[PDB]
Design a protein around this motif. Sequence first.
Motif, mmCIF file in Angstrom:
data_model
loop_
_atom_site.group_PDB
_atom_site.id
_atom_site.type_symbol
_atom_site.label_atom_id
_atom_site.label_comp_id
_atom_site.label_asym_id
_atom_site.label_seq_id
_atom_site.Cartn_x
_atom_site.Cartn_y
_atom_site.Cartn_z
ATOM 1 N N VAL A 50 6.338 -2.769 -11.902
ATOM 2 C CA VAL A 50 6.412 -2.095 -10.785
ATOM 3 C C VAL A 50 7.764 -1.331 -10.880
ATOM 4 N N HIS A 52 -12.689 2.777 -5.719
ATOM 5 C CA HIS A 52 -11.426 2.784 -5.102
ATOM 6 C C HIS A 52 -11.039 3.479 -3.985
ATOM 7 N N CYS A 59 4.113 1.267 -1.324
ATOM 8 C CA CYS A 59 4.815 1.477 -2.674
ATOM 9 C C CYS A 59 3.828 2.230 -3.649
ATOM 10 N N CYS A 60 2.502 1.561 -3.761
ATOM 11 C CA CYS A 60 1.526 2.349 -4.610
ATOM 12 C C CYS A 60 1.422 3.756 -4.218
ATOM 13 N N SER A 95 1.635 7.063 -6.521
ATOM 14 C CA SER A 95 0.654 8.256 -6.792
ATOM 15 C C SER A 95 1.149 9.514 -6.599
ATOM 16 N N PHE A 131 -7.797 -5.407 0.572
ATOM 17 C CA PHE A 131 -6.443 -5.419 -0.086
ATOM 18 C C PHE A 131 -6.319 -6.091 -1.566
ATOM 19 N N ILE A 182 -8.575 -4.493 -4.380
ATOM 20 C CA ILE A 182 -8.366 -3.221 -4.822
ATOM 21 C C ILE A 182 -7.841 -3.188 -6.332
ATOM 22 N N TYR A 235 -8.249 12.764 -1.227
ATOM 23 C CA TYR A 235 -9.299 12.139 -0.775
ATOM 24 C C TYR A 235 -10.102 12.914 0.185
ATOM 25 N N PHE A 271 0.788 -1.177 -0.017
ATOM 26 C CA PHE A 271 -0.055 0.052 -0.003
ATOM 27 C C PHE A 271 0.848 1.406 -0.139
ATOM 28 N N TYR A 316 -6.829 11.101 -10.326
ATOM 29 C CA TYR A 316 -6.990 9.500 -10.003
ATOM 30 C C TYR A 316 -7.555 8.908 -11.367
HETATM 31 C C1 LIG Z 1 -2.321 3.577 -1.645
HETATM 32 C C2 LIG Z 1 -2.822 2.532 -2.701
HETATM 33 C C3 LIG Z 1 -2.671 1.097 -2.596
HETATM 34 C C4 LIG Z 1 -3.357 0.236 -3.489
HETATM 35 O O1 LIG Z 1 -3.704 0.259 -4.519
HETATM 36 C C5 LIG Z 1 -3.009 -1.418 -3.123
HETATM 37 C C6 LIG Z 1 -2.741 -1.716 -1.704
HETATM 38 C C7 LIG Z 1 -2.419 -3.266 -1.532
HETATM 39 C C8 LIG Z 1 -2.844 -4.189 -2.400
HETATM 40 C C9 LIG Z 1 -3.189 -3.794 -3.659
HETATM 41 C C10 LIG Z 1 -3.315 -2.447 -4.121
HETATM 42 N N1 LIG Z 1 -3.084 2.719 -3.986
HETATM 43 C C11 LIG Z 1 -3.275 4.276 -4.754
HETATM 44 C C12 LIG Z 1 -3.413 4.274 -6.292
HETATM 45 C C13 LIG Z 1 -2.487 3.131 -6.879
HETATM 46 C C14 LIG Z 1 -1.002 3.950 -7.270
HETATM 47 C C15 LIG Z 1 -0.176 2.676 -7.793
HETATM 48 C C16 LIG Z 1 -0.611 1.441 -8.286
HETATM 49 O O2 LIG Z 1 0.112 0.446 -8.867
HETATM 50 C C17 LIG Z 1 1.482 0.661 -9.013
HETATM 51 C C18 LIG Z 1 2.310 -0.499 -9.281
HETATM 52 C C19 LIG Z 1 2.712 -1.438 -8.147
HETATM 53 N N2 LIG Z 1 3.971 -1.556 -7.307
HETATM 54 C C20 LIG Z 1 3.811 -2.388 -6.285
HETATM 55 C C21 LIG Z 1 4.952 -2.769 -5.416
HETATM 56 C C22 LIG Z 1 6.314 -1.930 -5.725
HETATM 57 C C23 LIG Z 1 7.214 -2.225 -4.717
HETATM 58 C C24 LIG Z 1 7.262 -3.293 -3.792
HETATM 59 C C25 LIG Z 1 5.814 -3.851 -3.373
HETATM 60 C C26 LIG Z 1 4.946 -3.436 -4.443
HETATM 61 O O3 LIG Z 1 2.570 -2.803 -6.323
HETATM 62 C C27 LIG Z 1 1.779 -2.232 -7.084
HETATM 63 C C28 LIG Z 1 0.232 -2.539 -7.517
HETATM 64 C C29 LIG Z 1 -1.999 1.232 -7.871
HETATM 65 C C30 LIG Z 1 -2.835 1.915 -7.229
HETATM 66 C C31 LIG Z 1 -4.040 5.496 -4.039
HETATM 67 O O4 LIG Z 1 -5.034 5.374 -3.498
HETATM 68 O O5 LIG Z 1 -3.257 6.512 -3.998
#
Ligand SMILES: C/C(=C/C(=O)c1ccccc1)N[C@@H](Cc1ccc(OCCc2nc(-c3ccccc3)oc2C)cc1)C(=O)O
Lengths: 267, 13
Positions: free
Chosen positions: A131, A239, A74-75, A79, A150, A153, A263, A72, A113
């Motif tokens: 990623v 989302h 890293c995403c 963003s 999670f 999502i 948000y 969560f 978004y």
């Molecule tokens: C805060 C948030 C969390 C969220 O969407 C999530 C949390 C847990 C499980 C699944 C999804 N999400 C964002 C919007 C967003 C940004 C980037 C993205 O992918 C970006 C690609 C990417 N990179 C990694 C990663 C990199 C390094 C280590 C581990 C994982 O993982 C992913 C999906 C997906 C979604 C928001 O609300 O602002």
Amino acid sequence: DLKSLAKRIYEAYLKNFNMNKVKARVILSGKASNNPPFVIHDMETLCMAEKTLVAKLVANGIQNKEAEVRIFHCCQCTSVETVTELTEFAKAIPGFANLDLNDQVTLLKYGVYEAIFAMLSSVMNKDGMLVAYGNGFITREFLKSLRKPFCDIMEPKFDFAMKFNALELDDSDISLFVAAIICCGDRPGLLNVGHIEKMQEGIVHVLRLHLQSNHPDDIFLFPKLLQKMADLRQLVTEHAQLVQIIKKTESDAALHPLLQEIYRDMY
Amino acid sequence: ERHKILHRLLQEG
Ligand SMILES: C/C(=C/C(=O)c1ccccc1)N[C@@H](Cc1ccc(OCCc2nc(-c3ccccc3)oc2C)cc1)C(=O)O
């Protein structure tokens, strides 16, 4: 005429963004010289990846903070950076920088978004997504093996991306499309509604004409995209809701201030 | 609302 606009917006796009559909597709299949993405498909490989991506989430108590929260985070980072590139892109848009700053921070608040999930489709495929600037690739399967919510999502983002990528838009289409989503004259709290609207008519028109010549055979592509704008809108809604849950039923996953205010009082 | 950060980012950087 307004065609010098199309190229205008496209130049800003190519500049303001580090990753683009063109590179995304070369990476996600095409070895060529070399550099095949590290695959994060389970917990072990996840930790392996973080071990490099931090010396901060591998040896700082975070090496063992629920994986869901690490992800969560890293995403969250992606963003923030994207919301940042998105701000410059918008300012490089003819008319945007002439609007009242409050209308600016209003268009960016509701379109940021919709834009994110749009451009993110570029780096996704039916099996997972790139990623860390294309260096890694996290499987769609691994993400659904996480605990709720999670694991709920990204699935919707994958379904949208599969239908969205079928339209086979290229970077130029996407720059106009993204500008169209950001310059939406139907946002809440909009002061100078009148102008933002005409601005919209401008870029949408430009886009219509662009797709008409760029993709002459997809015929009803313009209307398809119009529908996808509404789709992105609902995706965002869902989302945002998905996050409000976590945010209050997972106190360990805090949100960055920048994202906190977007948000904040959104839907 | 507030958006103290979105402002700071529209200025120039
Ligand atoms: C805060 C948030 C969390 C969220 O969407 C999530 C949390 C847990 C499980 C699944 C999804 N999400 C964002 C919007 C967003 C940004 C980037 C993205 O992918 C970006 C690609 C990417 N990179 C990694 C990663 C990199 C390094 C280590 C581990 C994982 O993982 C992913 C999906 C997906 C979604 C928001 O609300 O602002």
